[PDB]
Design a protein around this ligand. Structure first.
Ligand SMILES: [Mg+2]
Lengths: 99, 79, 1337
DNA sequence: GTCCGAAGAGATTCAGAG
DNA sequence: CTCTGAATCTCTTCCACTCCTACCAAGGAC
RNA sequence: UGGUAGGAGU
């Protein structure tokens, strides 16, 4: 048995999931987002992808909102995507979020 | 402790915009000072909004017209 | 903010623009001091400060200073978080080629320069000199020569010969080359080559040059002059917490590259001899190659313990890369995991949840409630109070989780139902309590199984889980309409025990007032649960629309059935309860309740059924014992008889009378017969074992044996399990697959000796390994299927198209494999269905077929109905709601925004674990004979021999469908004439497969076509006839002269003139294959209808499904007729057999090769229809698509996959396979460019060409013509328009390079791509937001 | 105080053949 | 002797969640 | 700490 509400995070700002060793969060694997989006559930998928995993600003804003009785959500951008952007830019390939 | 959604789905057939309208109504209740229309009995705002949608007194057009009335009241207080 | 992601090859100017500084010193942060070095990979000056809002130096460490730089430190005073964003650069002393654009299958740098990749590799590593600006020299600049050859050239030419070494020469050639002039020259060459093989790779070079021209990038940017460095925080030197620091294996590679570059710079300053400088340049280039892609070229540089270093490329691709591990597999907070256990007290929508787990998961909600109520003033006080788990905290917790659903999922999530939402109830313990009925969908087994829980935080997420994911909503599986909840193990056993009758029991013959009286009697013990009685039952039937009328009558039912009637809802009839109520009966009753009374009564009924079944199964006290499994008394006698027979056969073999193979086959047959007899005797003794004496005389009844009760009810076990428990275990196969001669005589009730146990262990281990690998194979197939069909979403509502596929029941020479009503249920019609009464229509054009419409279709029983399908949908980027039809999970047309692609892929991939890896025609029933594609010739005997290669023998019943259809080979005689009914069991057609007869038109003399004396024909002696029979000699066997002339037979009249075929001017000719025995010699009169010659005469598992969806060409494919016409043979067996065909209206020159080892069965004279096979064998789907169109290949793939799935017993609707097929054939090649700007050889998306053609027909310009193309699922996924979806799937490096050179721009709009980005997916509840965003643009 | 299998698809080549 | 076919080599991928237990890694020289 | 294997559970 294990559970986690908020703990440590890695360099990619995801939770380490050392299991019970370092208070890890259960991984929402690739085959689970398929089932989440097969239901047509978009908002749950968005919150699991951004607010509970990588959006550090989203994380702190959501935590502050919950204790105040509000249940809003700021989507933001996951930090894993920015890490990937920097990784690809490091190979001389230009990645840009053009508007 | 509502167990089914089918009866509320009959009001809004898509069952996908039902989530959107119910979320909007529940956000209106729990964030603003709005008090529920259907009587409340120690229930979360989720089920309160769903029960209102079931009774037929809440719809997307109803929410839109209510928002228009609040906008008119707000602009009236300005002058 | 953003709306697209663009890829471009970065210029060195862009690299410098990104950089906030320069890296020159290889040394990283000092080990002895916490301070980062001045010019290291971790530099505070060129990257962010180590401490946020504080400069490294003390004088500027104060937080007040904003955006200031210390004069000596040279470090900004911003937060440390920018250290992840800041990037640096290093200036390489010498240009180095980018590895990705090299050493690849496309060889883009090689394709640009049009010189062999080995030459590039030779030049880069300083082996062969390539010349630039040759000028007046005889040899061209593109050619490459050796170093000694370069010395000879320089002794020949002093200055005009310029040959550079390494990447510098390549960059010089890239700069020198001009794209547009080479483009026009290559286009001219393409116009001049006129050979398709030369067009290959030349069109590729032209496309690469055009992509470089259109994109705003220059080829010289491919050669790397400035190398970016990753931000230091991304590659961290994490402390060990002990001695020394960790190395990310990336800082090591960067250090190596920097050190080599600095050493090369020092050598340049010192002006070292050219050999040493070239060696150092090679070392630096190799270091850069190792940094960018370790192991791409040569062997990967290893840090220690023989573990290759993980380069930058290696940490993007693969399962361990960002794309799979982190972007799509983000770990989630507010989650927990624990062992699961069964709770029968729970309702359907509820689930157990430990108090400690609930307290930990819902902690922020508890804090908020404490702050609102006022017990805790600050967050720290609330945290301390919760850690103390005081009394008030539990009361607050009960309020929080009162109506907050939690998401529960199993470790493997195959179904859509693999994750479901429940309303939690606080329990004590450490195990999650799960509802027994729910566990069927989860595949949970309650044997150490674990399940993770997740908490939806936002209000939208809570509403979403309640509306969609709650277990009460998921009643019907999306794969097929059958219910997903069903009483499984103990509830079904209890219901079966309750609803059963005993011949004599306490309380028999009573007449009761109602079900309450029956319960009262059973409880008080006056009447038994199985006593037959007469109970007055109030039965409600909804004869009126929305109204129920009561019907009361006396019924002959047992006490148990009457007791069960109380929980049944009002609408259902009483006929369902009166039976024995096995598992199928319970499932049917639940489905009937769902059909009649809706959802809420069905949920209440399911809960009541589960409770009642559990209670009465417990009260029954069913148990298993060693006396329950009874061994038949005749087993010993049957075994003795079988052993006597096998000994007799062995004795016959000893004398040599019977061969060893036939002896083994007879032994196998004898043992199979003995096993069948033993099993039948045991089952007969078991099922009616109990004999009850009632009111005097004895009587027989169905036994109450506990094992038999378990088997009959379907609760557990089967016929095979009982056969193994109380009978012969049967013959067991060897690992190779052969059958062991001696079966396992002993059952499991009695002992098994050592040898029999070993024989059993063979198959047991084989099956275990089969399952262990089936898991992984099915997982991979499911992943490919999900990705190939991610984008499909029901976008529009109606297309108004008329094209559709034809639905007919599948008849494989026997009983109906699939009833017609099952395939067409829930699908709309493309065209109005015609009534069997002529000039009348049964069904309108665009009406959706449901149970009632199908039933009305059943009465008229029309076989062929046209149905709109997914592949025929004309809507671009999605399908309409009408083409898809029913949702298969709810009784409704599919809603807009449904993600049908993922549902289809998961439904297909779920049964994958079940799928393992490794004459005369007589009709059974009477009916009318239908014969199609037939050229019958009758002889004196009245038999009819068909000339056509493919002809269909069909049986018509009274209502008209083909009950049984058999393929009739060419040359099969026919018993009874067509159009008349034939009695059952009568052989309609007869033939000898070994010898193929040859059709003739009129009796007369024969002389062989292209007659040559002796070589064409030579008599062969036969012992049976006693006279030599003419046999056409083989082309190789006969001499050259005879083999050059066509071997065939021409009929001639008795007078001597050649016989011409009736109805045509040309003289009759009949095929004579090489080495074919001819029954009637040339110069011998024949009879009408006689034969002129004789010609001598596959996986069902998961790999078959993988091959079907991959559309791989079979090892031995079949050839077909590309264009209809009369067949001809221009040249025979000269290099390769040549076939020419000409259509009637205008002869068309045709060329075709037929291999010798492949037999050719098409007649030389008979006209062949387009798409007819010339060689029997497996058909490649590409040929089917190219010849017979999209509908035929769709039908073929659907039929084959369904036939594979039917054998295992699974049921998957055809709509999902049709969706996958639609996703497969998305690309169309341009037949003719037309007015539109599309290259002829280029391949474009079918939707784009459809849009362009529609725009052109809107104007006066003529549209382009296209040919559809079929691609495998892997190729289709990798060839999608967006590079993000392809990069996340497979082959990240290849697709990234292809997008880099082409400068692709990704518009998102996908499901996987939006998931990667982090936005709302276009499907489901995000559809409204996405369409609003589209409208605002 | 500081520094140096196995399965498949695909690209390339290569031997036959006219 | 160009030029469709067959030989070779060469790259890529082989499920998904945990429980853990260890092995591993830049100096003396200037 | 972090990367590797090693065994095990479903
Ligand atoms: Mg289990």
């Amino acid at each position: 048995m294990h559970a986690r509400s908020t703990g440590s995070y890695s360099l990619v700002t995801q939770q380490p999931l050392g299991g019970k060793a370092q208070f890890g969060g259960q991984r929402f694997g690739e085959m689970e987002v398929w089932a989440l989006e097969a239901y047509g559930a978009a908002y749950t998928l968005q919150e699991m992808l951004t607010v509970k995993s990588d959006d550090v600003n989203g994380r702190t804003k959501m935590y502050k909102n919950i204790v105040d009785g509000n249940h809003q959500m700021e989507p933001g951008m996951p930090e894993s995507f920015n890490v990937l952007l920097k990784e690809i830019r490091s190979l001389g390939i230009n990645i840009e979020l053009e508007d | 402790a509502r167990v089914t959604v089918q009866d509320a789905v009959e009001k809004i057939g898509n069952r996908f915009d039902l989530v959107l309208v119910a979320a909007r109504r529940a956000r209106q209740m729990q964030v603003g000072g709005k008090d529920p229309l259907v009587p409340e009995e120690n229930d979360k705002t989720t089920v309160i909004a769903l029960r209102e949608i079931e009774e037929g007194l809440i719809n997307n057009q109803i929410l839109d017209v209510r928002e228009r009335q609040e906008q008119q009241e707000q602009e009236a207080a300005e002058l | 903010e953003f709306d697209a992601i663009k890829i471009a090859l970065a210029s060195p100017d862009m690299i410098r623009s990104w950089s906030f500084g320069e890296v020159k010193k290889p040394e990283t942060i000092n080990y002895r001091t916490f301070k980062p070095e001045r010019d290291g990979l971790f530099c505070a000056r060129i990257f962010g400060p180590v401490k946020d809002y504080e400069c490294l130096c003390g004088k500027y460490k104060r937080l007040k200073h904003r955006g200031v730089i210390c004069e000596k430190c040279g470090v900004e005073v911003t937060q440390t978080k920018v250290r992840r964003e800041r990037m640096g650069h290093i200036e390489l002393a010498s240009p180095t080629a980018h590895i990705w654009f090299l050493k690849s299958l496309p060889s883009r740098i090689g394709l640009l320069l049009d010189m062999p990749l080995r030459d590039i590799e030779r030049v880069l590593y300083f082996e062969s000199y390539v010349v630039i600006e040759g000028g007046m020299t005889n040899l061209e600049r593109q050619q490459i020569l050796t170093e000694e050859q370069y010395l000879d050239a320089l002794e020949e030419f002093g200055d005009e010969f310029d040959a550079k070494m390494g990447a510098e020469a390549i960059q010089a050639l890239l700069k020198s080359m001009d794209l547009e002039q080479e483009c026009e020259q290559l286009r001219e060459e393409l116009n001049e080559t006129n050979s398709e093989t030369k067009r290959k790779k030349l069109t590729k070079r032209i496309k690469l040059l055009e992509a470089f021209v259109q994109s705003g990038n220059k080829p010289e940017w491919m050669i790397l002059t400035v190398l970016p460095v990753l931000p230091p925080d991304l590659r961290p030197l994490v402390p060990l917490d002990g001695g020394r620091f960790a190395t990310s294996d990336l800082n090591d590679l960067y250090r190596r590259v920097i050190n080599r570059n600095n050493r090369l710079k020092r050598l340049l300053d010192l002006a070292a001899p050219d050999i040493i400088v070239r060696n150092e340049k090679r070392m630096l280039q190799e270091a850069v190659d190792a940094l960018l892609d370790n192991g791409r070229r040569g062997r990967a540089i290893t840090g220690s313990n023989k573990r290759p270093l993980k380069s930058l490329a290696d940490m993007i691709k693969g399962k361990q890369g960002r794309f799979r591990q982190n972007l799509l597999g983000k770990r989630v907070d507010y989650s927990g995991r624990s062992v699961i256990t069964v709770g029968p007290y729970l309702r359907l929508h509820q689930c157990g949840l430990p108090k400690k787990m609930a307290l930990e998961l819902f902690k922020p909600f508890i804090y908020g409630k404490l702050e609102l109520r006022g017990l805790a003033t600050t967050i720290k006080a609330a945290k301390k109070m919760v850690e103390r788990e005081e009394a008030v905290v539990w009361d607050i917790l009960d309020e929080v989780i009162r109506e907050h659903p939690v998401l529960l999922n199993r470790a493997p999530t195959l179904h859509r139902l693999g994750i479901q939402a429940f309303e939690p109830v606080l329990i004590e313990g450490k195990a999650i309590q799960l509802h027994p009925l729910v566990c069927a969908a989860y595949n949970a087994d309650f044997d150490g199984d674990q399940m993770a829980v997740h908490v939806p935080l936002t209000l939208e997420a809570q509403l979403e889980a309640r509306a969609l994911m709650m277990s009460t909503n998921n009643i019907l599986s999306p794969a097929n309409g059958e219910p997903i909840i069903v009483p499984s193990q103990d509830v079904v056993l209890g219901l079966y025990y309750m609803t059963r009758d005993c011949v004599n029991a306490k309380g028999e013959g009573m007449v009761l007032t109602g079900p309450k009286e029956a319960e009262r009697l059973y409880r008080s013990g006056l009447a038994s649960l199985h006593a037959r009685v007469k109970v007055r039952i109030t039965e409600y039937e909804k004869d009126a629309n929305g109204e129920l009328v009561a019907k009361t009558s006396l019924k002959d039912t047992t006490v148990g059935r009457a007791i069960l009637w109380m929980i049944v809802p009002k609408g259902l009839p009483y006929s369902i309860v009166n039976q024995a109520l096995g598992k199928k009966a319970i499932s049917k009753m639940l489905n009937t309740c769902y059909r009649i009374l809706g959802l809420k009564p069905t949920v209440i009924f399911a809960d009541q059924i589960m409770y009642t079944g559990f209670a009465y199964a417990a009260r029954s006290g069913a148990s298993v014992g060693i006396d329950d499994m009874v061994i038949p008394e005749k087993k010993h006698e049957i075994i003795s008889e079988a052993e006597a027979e096998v000994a007799e056969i062995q004795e016959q073999f000893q004398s040599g009378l019977v061969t060893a193979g036939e002896r083994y086959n007879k032994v196998i047959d004898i043992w199979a017969a003995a096993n069948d007899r033993v099993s039948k005797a045991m089952m007969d003794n078991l099922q009616t074992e109990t004999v009850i004496n009632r009111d005097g005389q004895e009587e027989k009844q169905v036994s109450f044996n506990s094992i038999y009760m378990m088997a009959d009810s379907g609760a557990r076990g089967s016929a095979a399990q009982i056969r193994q428990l109380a009978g012969m275990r049967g013959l067991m196969a060897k690992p190779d697959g052969s059958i062991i001669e001696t079966p396992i005589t002993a059952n499991f009730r009695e002992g098994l000796n050592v040898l029999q146990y070993f024989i059993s262990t063979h198959g047991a281990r084989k099956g275990l390994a089969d399952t262990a690998l089936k898991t992984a194979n099915s997982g991979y197939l499911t992943r490919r299927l999900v990705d190939v069909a991610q984008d499909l979403v029901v976008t529009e509502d109606d297309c108004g198209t008329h094209e559709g596929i034809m639905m007919t029941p599948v008849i494989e020479g026997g009983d109906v494999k699939e009833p017609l009503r099952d395939r067409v249920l829930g699908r709309v019609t493309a065209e109005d269905v015609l009534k069997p009464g002529t000039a009348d229509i049964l069904v309108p054009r665009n009406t959706l077929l449901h149970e009632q419409w199908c039933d009305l279709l059943e009465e008229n029983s029309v076989d062929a109905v046209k149905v709109r399908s997914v592949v025929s949908c004309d809507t671009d980027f999605g399908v309409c709601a009408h083409c898809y039809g029913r949702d298969l999970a709810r009784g409704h047309i599919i809603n807009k925004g449904e993600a049908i692609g993922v549902i289809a892929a998961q439904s297909i991939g779920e049964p994958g674990t079940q799928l393992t890896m490794r004459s005369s025609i007589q009709v059974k029933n009477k009916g009318s004979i239908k014969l199609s594609n037939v050229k019958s010739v009758v002889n004196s005997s009245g038999k009819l021999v068909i000339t056509s290669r493919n002809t269909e023998l069909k049986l018509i019943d009274e209502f008209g469908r083909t009950k049984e259809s058999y393929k009739v080979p060419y040359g099969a005689v026919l018993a009874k004439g067509d159009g008349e009914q034939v009695a059952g069991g009568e052989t309609v057609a007869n033939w000898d497969p070994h010898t193929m007869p040859v059709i003739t038109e009129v009796s007369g003399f024969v002389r062989f076509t292209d007659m040559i004396d002796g070589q064409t024909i030579t008599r062969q002696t036969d012992e049976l006839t006693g006279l030599s029979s003419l046999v056409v000699l083989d082309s190789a066997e006969r001499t050259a002269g005879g083999k050059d002339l066509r071997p065939a037979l021409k009929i001639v009249d008795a007078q001597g003139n050649d016989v011409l075929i009736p109805g045509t001017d040309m003289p009759a000719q009949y095929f004579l294959p090489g080495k074919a025995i001819v029954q009637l010699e040339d110069g011998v009169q024949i009879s009408s209808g006689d034969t002129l010659a004789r010609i001598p005469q596959i996986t069902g598992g998961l790999p078959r499904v993988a091959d079907l969806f991959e559309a791989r060409r079979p090892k031995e494919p079949a050839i077909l007729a590309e264009i209809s016409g009369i067949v001809s043979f221009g040249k025979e067996t000269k290099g390769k057999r040549r076939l020419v065909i000409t259509p009637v209206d205008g002869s068309d020159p045709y060329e075709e090769m037929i291999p010798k080892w492949r037999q050719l069965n098409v007649f030389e004279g008979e006209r062949v229809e387009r798409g007819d096979v010339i060689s029997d064998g497996p058909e490649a789907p590409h040929d089917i698509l190219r010849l017979r169109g999209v509908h035929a290949v769709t039908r073929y793939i659907v039929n084959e996959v369904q036939d594979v799935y039917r054998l295992q017993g699974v049921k998957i609707n055809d709509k999902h396979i049709e969706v996958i097929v639609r996703q497969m054939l998305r690309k169309a090649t341009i037949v003719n460019a037309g007015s539109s700007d599309f290259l002829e050889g280029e391949q474009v998306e079918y939707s784009r060409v459809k849009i362009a053609n529609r725009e052109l027909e809107a104007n006066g310009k003529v549209g382009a013509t296209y040919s559809r193309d079929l691609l495998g699922i892997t190729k289709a996924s990798l060839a999608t328009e967006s590079f993000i979806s392809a990069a996340s799937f497979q082959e990240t490096t290849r697709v990234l390079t292809e997008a880099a050179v082409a400068g692709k721009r990704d518009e998102l709009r996908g499901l996987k791509e939006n998931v990667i980005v982090g936005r709302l997916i276009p499907a489901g509840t995000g559809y409204a937001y996405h369409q609003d965003r589209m409208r605002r643009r």
